[PDB]
Amino acid sequence: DSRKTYTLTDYLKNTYRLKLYSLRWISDHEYLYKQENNILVFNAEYGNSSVFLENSTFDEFGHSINDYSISPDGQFILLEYNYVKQWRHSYTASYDIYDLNKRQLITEERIPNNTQWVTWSPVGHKLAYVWNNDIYVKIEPNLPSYRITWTGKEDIIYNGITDWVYEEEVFSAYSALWWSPNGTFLAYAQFNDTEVPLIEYSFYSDESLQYPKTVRVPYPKAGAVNPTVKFFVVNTDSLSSVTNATSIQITAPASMLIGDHYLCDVTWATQERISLQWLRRIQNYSVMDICDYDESSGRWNCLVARQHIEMSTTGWVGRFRPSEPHFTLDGNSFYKIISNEEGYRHICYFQIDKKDCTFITKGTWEVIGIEALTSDYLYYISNEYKGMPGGRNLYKIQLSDYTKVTCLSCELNPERCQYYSVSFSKEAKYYQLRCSGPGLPLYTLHSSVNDKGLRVLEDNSALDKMLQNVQMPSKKLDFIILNETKFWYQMILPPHFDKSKKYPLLLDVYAGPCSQKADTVFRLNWATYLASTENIIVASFDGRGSGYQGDKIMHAINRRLGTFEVEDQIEAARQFSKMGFVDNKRIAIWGWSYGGYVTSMVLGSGSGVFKCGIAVAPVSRWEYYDSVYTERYMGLPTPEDNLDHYRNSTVMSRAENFKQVEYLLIHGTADDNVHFQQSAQISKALVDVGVDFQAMWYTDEDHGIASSTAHQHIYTHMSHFIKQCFSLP
Amino acid sequence: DSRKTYTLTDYLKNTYRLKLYSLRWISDHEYLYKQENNILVFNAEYGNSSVFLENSTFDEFGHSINDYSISPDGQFILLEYNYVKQWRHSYTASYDIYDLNKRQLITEERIPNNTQWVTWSPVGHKLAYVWNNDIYVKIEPNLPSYRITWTGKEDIIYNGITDWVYEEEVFSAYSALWWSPNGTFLAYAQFNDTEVPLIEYSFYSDESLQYPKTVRVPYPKAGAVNPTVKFFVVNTDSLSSVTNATSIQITAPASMLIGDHYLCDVTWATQERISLQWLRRIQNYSVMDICDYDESSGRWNCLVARQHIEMSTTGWVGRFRPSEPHFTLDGNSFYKIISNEEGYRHICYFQIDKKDCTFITKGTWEVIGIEALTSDYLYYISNEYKGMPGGRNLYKIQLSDYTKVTCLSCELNPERCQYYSVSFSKEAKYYQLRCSGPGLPLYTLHSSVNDKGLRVLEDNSALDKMLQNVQMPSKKLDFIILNETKFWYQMILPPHFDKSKKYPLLLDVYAGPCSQKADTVFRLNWATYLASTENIIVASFDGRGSGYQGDKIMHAINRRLGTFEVEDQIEAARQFSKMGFVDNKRIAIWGWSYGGYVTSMVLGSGSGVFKCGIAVAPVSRWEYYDSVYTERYMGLPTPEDNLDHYRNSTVMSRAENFKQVEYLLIHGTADDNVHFQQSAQISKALVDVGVDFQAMWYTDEDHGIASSTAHQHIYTHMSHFIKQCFSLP
Ligand SMILES: *[C@@H]1O[C@H](CO)[C@@H](O[C@H]2O[C@H](CO)[C@@H](O[C@@H]3O[C@H](CO[C@H]4O[C@H](CO)[C@@H](O)[C@H](O)[C@@H]4O)[C@@H](O)[C@H](O)[C@@H]3O)[C@H](O)[C@H]2NC(C)=O)[C@H](O)[C@H]1NC(C)=O
Ligand SMILES: *[C@@H]1O[C@H](CO)[C@@H](O[C@H]2O[C@H](CO)[C@@H](O[C@@H]3O[C@H](CO[C@H]4O[C@H](CO)[C@@H](O)[C@H](O)[C@@H]4O)[C@@H](O)[C@H](O)[C@@H]3O)[C@H](O)[C@H]2NC(C)=O)[C@H](O)[C@H]1NC(C)=O
Ligand SMILES: *[C@@H]1O[C@H](CO)[C@@H](O[C@@H]2O[C@H](CO)[C@@H](O)[C@H](O)[C@H]2NC(C)=O)[C@H](O)[C@H]1NC(C)=O
Ligand SMILES: *[C@@H]1O[C@H](CO)[C@@H](O[C@@H]2O[C@H](CO)[C@@H](O)[C@H](O)[C@H]2NC(C)=O)[C@H](O)[C@H]1NC(C)=O
Ligand SMILES: N[C@H]1CN(C(=O)c2cnc3ccccc3n2)C[C@H]1C(=O)N1CCCC1
Ligand SMILES: N[C@H]1CN(C(=O)c2cnc3ccccc3n2)C[C@H]1C(=O)N1CCCC1
Ligand SMILES: *[C@@H]1O[C@H](CO)[C@@H](O)[C@H](O)[C@H]1NC(C)=O
Ligand SMILES: *[C@@H]1O[C@H](CO)[C@@H](O)[C@H](O)[C@H]1NC(C)=O
Ligand SMILES: *[C@@H]1O[C@H](CO)[C@@H](O)[C@H](O)[C@H]1NC(C)=O
């Protein structure tokens, strides 16, 4: 075989690209899509297309455009430029608006520079935006905006945007605003960061910056003072240019105010109904609150009877946060993924005035998401098929009979497609399926009415040709049985696999609570190269604590972080040499983030099983990470709660055992998420007991070391280390 | 040969110790010295000895003692405990005093905790001390102290102690107080740090510290706002417990106040005369000021006529700062090392009212220090002998005839002793010589009167026995001629040197202005091990910019830092392969601090001469280091001064050329001196142009990475890297 291999350059220089088919539905039958640099609008029934915005319409604007948003009446286009990243989701941009009819960009009362956030109303053309931490409402794209709040202060009070910890661990968003469907109301949370300690660190910046900057961020580490939250709603119809605006407080429920709480979900039900979810700072108790609007008063009442109590006896509420509720149009009921009696997460029918819910699904598998609700059907993604947790399909359930369920994706392309996800049009007339493994990604449009497939949207046939020229590796997905339970793993095997030759093995890891590293998705990444070019088995394994296989597995790690999930990776490595094609002198292990923490705990176990490891951005000690996440699993680090295991579980206490292995610690110096301090303490520990190891800092890089030059650099560096331990040229 | 070699453990575990003979003269014939843990007093004429303080006299004190100081009348002992390091010289301690006669430690009016500084008067038992940045005077060891100043503020105003930059680059001391010989006056400088930018960085501290501390320090980087200085004197006799104390300002001279200046020397002449030296922020102009005391007034006048103007046409004033003046007893004259017409530094006789000075020495060598002044003789250290800059001896000059000079150390032990230094008794009746190379360190006591040697004090005969058991390397000191000038080098050659075998070579470097790495001193260090055990030639070389060989050499680098001193190391390496015993495939290079900066510039030169280098704590760009030092050599970094070479001389601009070499960057994260930022920018540069290299951070370590565990760790790490590039097992 004389074909080239998938090289390190291929991945790094990014030579073989998966084509995507990213669309934005704008109606019930049309969607928007990008071809080169103009925007095409498409008809879902027929396929036909038209130019909407040319890739020269903003030649003369003298500012490079970053994104764009379309008002829910096709009338105006928002243009996002001057983009500046903050955290995972946050940023600041400048914005201009363009009247699509008059072909003209607005000049009077512009959206101010460095805006934190901006979102259209659901109907019409109302904007809202957050700038210097306060909410503003523009009724029409060119009249003066109404200031809704006046409390906004840098690092202290956030109005309608989340703070650091809320952004990352609760909302997965900078945005803290919710319009009502009508567009009449605006609900927003407000966050108070006054007593929250700051993390401080250096940003060295460009060579021209003579003095390094100290970045400071309110960041509550385990057991420290959390942000407080308050919630307000405002009638955007009764807005005066003389009176300030009357915001209306919705207090948390009685059973939340007696201690620290978090606001963890905001979903509108109907024009005059909003549901709120709250979580105790001990995250095993959650309360949902139906808050109805009152005419006579101009206040929002939350009747104590309407509260629905979601709690857990064996661990924490929700996968990461508690599930979203999905409301029937009238608003008197809703479905919501909940953990059942046996422990598996399923769909539950809630009627808004009664206590009990009815389970409309069941069995030893879990529901991933609810995706669409019609009169007749609920559409959901699940891993039911072939009893494979790793897999993802799409199902519909007959509201008239919970027994009648059709699979809609299982049998569509079975050898190529075992992992689906979906986007539905505005009222669910069509749905794009996106398959993303085990074959090359496939994108197809469908019609809800009869479940007819219309056309294939992108098949990666161009990429498929190319890959035939290349000694591509394959993926084995399988399971191994420990303690009478089934745990799943994946191996990326090198091409021309000879099962009687002994191969060196890299165990890729994350293993954070409820994660999944053994799946049916097709990836082109570092592992491929180590399989194609270097002939290394790169295997991943989902052990206790892992996701999508019921609470009995996921909750095994409760308050015991850094125990079973670690232990398990070790036994996983053991069974891999038992299989006979593994060189038990050349087993390595590596991970990023949480994975870097498990990586280090493993090397630090003295199990003689691993020759070397790499840890990128590792958690090193749970009291160093954020409170919301850390506590969710570990409790509080106080002598009465879980201080003792908080101590029994540091990388540092395991320093002496590293004498037996080769270790490469990597960390970005600007890591706001897992602070450089986490590693700074792993290394000091190592130094102190006389252990040699390799380090690499990455200056100004954050948690994802995303910078193009840094990325290439790290995967280069990592590769050398890897080959070196394995004796390859 | 079956003898063991000098191993890495030997150096690290510190197996073969040089014995020292450290004494403190306390009179004209007695000195103090430590045997185990008691203090012995000695007679210089006869050798006899007595216990002074037993190593059990402070068993019952319940506090471990760090040092001790003896009042200039043998009456009380100061005891320094609770020692806490700050910078190179600064610290804070607790202090107790012990009445030696009554055998009792004082309890009323104790010296307060966290004292910055404390120093006895020259006669009697007056203390002065600095605590929370203010001067206090205790007249007797147990009456309430008098507060001299009230302006003291953390980080802002320093009374009688220096600030960061003054400590390091000007006074080489925390102490900023000077008693008059009588003990009547107290002069002190006061430093104002108000507009000085701060360097900020993280200190991660013990594992128990959940949030990393930000250390902030006023530190003026090149061209930034410097501290201002003011100078005061106080009559400690007229001190009232009702009136505050009247300090008396001595303003700098007219020709200093018109711009930024530094106070760079304070020497008392007689009971009522103090000399002050000042330096322009452009350090090529210095002015000394004779300030006489006035009876009638109670003020100090500095007559403009008495000023002595030291300046330079070819570079900067002084070696690092301008030389100390040494006063004849009456006070009307003094000697002072000055750079002569030809460029060599020599002794000059100054009479306090006339302009010209007379040179009392001359020739193509330099004076290192003045050491003693009597009626009849001036005692000085110089490198005159054998025309060897590397060497150090002791000379005396007949005040009655500048022609009659005797060498006093040259011919004392010639095969073993080429590098001397001295400590004289109170009125110069005796002097301990300390030789420290090329043989094992030797310590001998002498009598001034006739230059009789009395006895040998320590010869390291115990160490000498041991070393015979070991395959010790030798040192070749020699010179090579470039551009018709003589430049000196040293090679540590491995044992059983075969001059027809080709050896791998490590070029050790510092090469900062006026340094000396090629000398006759006997060291037992990392180089030895690389010579004894690994058979590597470790050679050092003093090129342009280097010290002790006249201004023509030292001033060659003026405003051209990072040019000739770099270029020269390269040509030094060239001539080393020309010699025939050097493997020109295995030449490496390394240095610390400045040396790390030259190291990096060299690897970054694309000269194909070096295979690999190590840089520890490197300067990376001159605008990142402190102003006083940086400007002394480079000027100001402004478009009109020397901004252009300030730019032409960064490591970063040389990033692409590193593709051709192996590089190990090391830095301590708590480096107050050369900030972590210096390397943080070398690495970011490297990342950016796709170059692979090895890094190691050292958390909480400072510029000397002195921590026991860190030390061992770095020299371990460094060793692996070294062997790896050289292909050794
Ligand atoms: C996909 O391709 C589609 C078919 O070409 C196309 O649908 C329409 O295209 C154009 C523009 O949208 C339509 O022309 C316009 O139609 C309206 C309505 O016309 C009807 O009504 C009038 C009066 O009531 C009658 O006199 C006519 O005979 C007709 O029935 C007109 O008012 C406009 O002036 C204009 O003529 C066209 O009718 C639509 N086609 C059909 C037959 O459905 C989409 O635009 C294409 N979509 C994309 C994604 O580009
Ligand atoms: C080194 O060894 C030295 C010799 O032993 C020693 O010098 C002296 O030792 C002791 C203690 O310091 C002295 O004893 C004391 O001496 C004084 C002076 O004595 C003279 O004067 C009186 C009256 O004027 C006469 O009556 C005497 O005869 C004598 O001449 C006495 O006042 C004390 O009470 C006491 O007796 C001794 O005299 C010194 N020795 C000599 C002869 O020089 C050092 O102490 C030793 N030093 C060290 C480093 O330990
Ligand atoms: C956002 O920032 C820019 C720059 O500060 C502003 O752009 C200027 O706009 C004026 C008036 O239209 C122009 O004449 C200039 O050409 C622009 N300045 C620049 C960048 O050179 C803009 O006004 C700001 N927008 C808002 C709403 O604050
Ligand atoms: C310096 O610090 C220590 C501790 O704060 C002080 O020592 C205490 O002294 C009192 C009275 O003598 C004792 O009873 C205690 O035993 C000591 N405390 C401790 C360390 O346990 C001391 O007084 C301080 N000195 C000054 C001058 O401020
Ligand atoms: N913040 C942790 C969670 N993350 C997620 O990507 C994630 C996944 N599912 C969510 C569901 C709901 C809300 C938030 C969610 N966040 C990143 C993790 C992370 O960076 N570290 C660093 C060390 C330990 C884990
Ligand atoms: N501060 C620099 C000077 N030093 C000395 O050790 C020294 C030598 N002779 C002196 C004479 C008078 C006053 C002060 C003196 N200081 C350390 C150097 C140093 O750390 N770096 C870091 C990067 C560049 C140089
Ligand atoms: C939207 O619905 C709300 C219900 O509160 C109603 O009061 C409002 O007038 C409606 N606005 C429109 C015109 O859609
Ligand atoms: C935020 O919280 C603190 C209480 O910790 C309070 O004193 C402060 O006024 C609050 N700020 C606002 C405006 O909500
Ligand atoms: C609204 O509130 C702001 C801040 O409290 C205040 O400055 C302003 O006067 C108010 N506006 C009016 C006109 O009521």
Ligand SMILES: *[C@@H]1O[C@H](CO)[C@@H](O)[C@H](O)[C@H]1NC(C)=O
């Ligand atoms: C939630 O967790 C706490 C932690 O100690 C525990 O005491 C309690 O049993 C749990 N509460 C509920 C309501 O399940």
Ligand SMILES: *[C@@H]1O[C@H](CO)[C@@H](O)[C@H](O)[C@H]1NC(C)=O
């Ligand atoms: C010391 O000398 C000074 C000269 O100013 C004199 O005034 C003072 O009284 C002297 N003190 C003693 C007793 O030594």
Ligand SMILES: *[C@@H]1O[C@H](CO)[C@@H](O)[C@H](O)[C@H]1NC(C)=O
């Ligand atoms: C120090 O300097 C500043 C001038 O930069 C001055 O305003 C301040 O008062 C001074 N502090 C003292 C007490 O000398």
Ligand SMILES: *[C@@H]1O[C@H](CO)[C@@H](O)[C@H](O)[C@H]1NC(C)=O
């Ligand atoms: C001395 O000065 C300090 C600070 O200016 C002041 O507080 C004190 O009153 C003064 N002492 C006396 C008693 O004159």
Ligand SMILES: *[C@@H]1O[C@H](CO)[C@@H](O)[C@H](O)[C@H]1NC(C)=O
């Ligand atoms: C000192 O250096 C400056 C720097 O530009 C130079 O202009 C001048 O010639 C020198 N001054 C003296 C007095 O030598």
